[PDB]
Design a binder for this molecule. Structure first.
Ligand SMILES: CC(=O)N[C@@H]1[C@@H](O)[C@H](O[C@@H]2O[C@H](CO)[C@@H](O[C@@H]3O[C@H](CO[C@H]4O[C@H](CO)[C@@H](O)[C@H](O)[C@@H]4O)[C@@H](O)[C@H](O[C@H]4O[C@H](CO)[C@@H](O)[C@H](O)[C@@H]4O)[C@@H]3O)[C@H](O)[C@H]2NC(C)=O)[C@@H](CO)O[C@H]1O
Ligand SMILES: CC(=O)N[C@@H]1[C@@H](O)[C@H](O[C@@H]2O[C@H](CO)[C@@H](O[C@@H]3O[C@H](CO[C@H]4O[C@H](CO)[C@@H](O)[C@H](O)[C@@H]4O)[C@@H](O)[C@H](O[C@H]4O[C@H](CO)[C@@H](O)[C@H](O)[C@@H]4O)[C@@H]3O)[C@H](O)[C@H]2NC(C)=O)[C@@H](CO)O[C@H]1O
Ligand SMILES: CC(=O)N[C@@H]1[C@@H](O)[C@H](O[C@@H]2O[C@H](CO)[C@@H](O[C@@H]3O[C@H](CO[C@H]4O[C@H](CO)[C@@H](O)[C@H](O)[C@@H]4O)[C@@H](O)[C@H](O[C@H]4O[C@H](CO)[C@@H](O)[C@H](O)[C@@H]4O)[C@@H]3O)[C@H](O)[C@H]2NC(C)=O)[C@@H](CO)O[C@H]1O
Ligand SMILES: CC(=O)N[C@@H]1[C@@H](O)[C@H](O[C@@H]2O[C@H](CO)[C@@H](O[C@@H]3O[C@H](CO[C@H]4O[C@H](CO)[C@@H](O)[C@H](O)[C@@H]4O)[C@@H](O)[C@H](O[C@H]4O[C@H](CO)[C@@H](O)[C@H](O)[C@@H]4O)[C@@H]3O)[C@H](O)[C@H]2NC(C)=O)[C@@H](CO)O[C@H]1O
Lengths: 113, 113
């Protein structure tokens, strides 16, 4: 199954640029550029519509840490981790850590491609 | 300046749950949940509207690697890196590498929060 969402691309100055960059942004997020896009902040930010898969499959995997906002306990981290990982189109491994006390934590995610 | 995009949150089964989960997804992406959300794939995926900043500012930073899709050369990576990093709400550091020949590459991004 698939769905669509707009993904930031930084400022895009013309449709010609957007049509060429959109596919690259989509590939980075394991999706497909739909061709639709728009500038959301004049001369500062544009977004591209990307079709994503509900479930990413494949024989390869890559693990890394991404921002998860502040997580105050392992209990909270184990509960929210799966959903935060899903927001990155990945899975939560269960590993995580606060990188700045009282400010920010990160969760380890696993990409499948 | 701020702009909005819908961010995946995995399946959300009720507004009651979405109102509790949306803020957490938003925080992980350095944004604010607006309260608006919707299921895009019945019983499988929902998205939450998040207000993002054109430029993420703050006194802290965090570097990490994320998927960039396959990058075929340093010339291409240096050209697309900034835009791919922007799609993650971060900056490109210039460092990158292919993790699976002919299939996937990753770029190092720098979050500021
Ligand atoms: C950062 C910055 O300020 N840059 C601006 C540039 O944005 C601007 O160039 C124009 O940018 C607009 C978007 O902001 C372009 O209009 C959008 O075009 C895309 C693509 O549409 C084409 O391709 C599709 C797929 O092939 C076709 O289906 C479609 O028919 C077209 O052939 C559309 O997806 C957008 O539509 C969405 O957004 C608009 C709102 O913007 C909604 O109304 C729609 O319902 C839909 O949701 C836009 O139509 C425009 O083409 C760009 N112009 C040129 C000449 O490239 C640039 C020049 O003004 O200025 C920079 O500063
Ligand atoms: C925003 C803020 O300030 N919040 C803090 C809270 O962070 C803090 O709660 C503790 O937070 C730390 C992380 O900073 C927790 O420790 C980490 O736990 C995870 C999860 O480990 C469990 O689950 C895994 C999966 O099931 C199991 O494999 C594992 O055995 C555990 O059961 C680990 O992934 C981390 O370990 C990794 O990272 C560290 C650091 O790089 C490495 O050294 C390790 O080798 C490993 O790679 C940590 O162990 C800790 O559990 C939290 N404590 C509690 C009680 O919940 C809170 C309290 O201090 O204060 C808030 O303010
Ligand atoms: C995985 C799965 O299948 N899950 C489904 C659940 O989705 C479903 O529960 C309903 O889900 C729908 C969305 O899919 C909910 O409707 C949306 O509600 C949000 C929130 O709206 C409230 O909160 C806002 C902020 O406080 C207020 O402004 C607003 O007035 C409400 O109080 C809205 O943001 C959505 O609106 C957007 O999307 C719709 C399309 O869905 C557009 O038409 C709108 O224009 C807008 O863009 C929706 O209105 C609904 O509330 C959920 N129902 C309940 C009872 O929780 C559940 C039951 O049907 O079944 C699960 O399986
Ligand atoms: C999908 C696919 O198969 N594509 C491959 C291409 O990858 C391949 O092109 C080469 O790709 C490698 C990466 O896999 C390139 O090497 C990396 O380059 C970046 C950038 O380095 C430059 O820029 C930095 C910033 O300006 C400078 O600091 C640096 O000095 C350079 O000027 C580096 O960040 C990488 O370094 C990391 O990885 C290596 C290897 O793991 C570590 O040793 C380092 O410590 C660090 O962690 C790499 O050095 C390489 O430049 C690409 N080659 C060319 C000619 O573009 C292509 C050709 O082989 O084939 C495709 O199929």
């Amino acid at each position: 199954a698939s769905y669509k969402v707009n993904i930031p691309a930084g400022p895009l100055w013309s449709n010609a640029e957007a049509q060429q960059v959109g596919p690259k942004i989509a590939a980075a997020h394991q999706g497909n550029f739909t061709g639709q896009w728009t500038t959301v902040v004049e001369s500062a930010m544009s977004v591209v519509e990307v079709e994503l898969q509900v479930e990413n499959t494949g024989i390869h995997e890559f693990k890394t840490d991404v921002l998860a906002g502040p997580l105050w306990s392992n209990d909270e981290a184990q509960k929210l981790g799966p959903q935060i990982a899903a927001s990155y189109g990945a899975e939560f491994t269960g590993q995580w850590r606060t990188i700045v006390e009282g400010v920010m934590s990160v969760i380890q995610i696993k990409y499948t491609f």
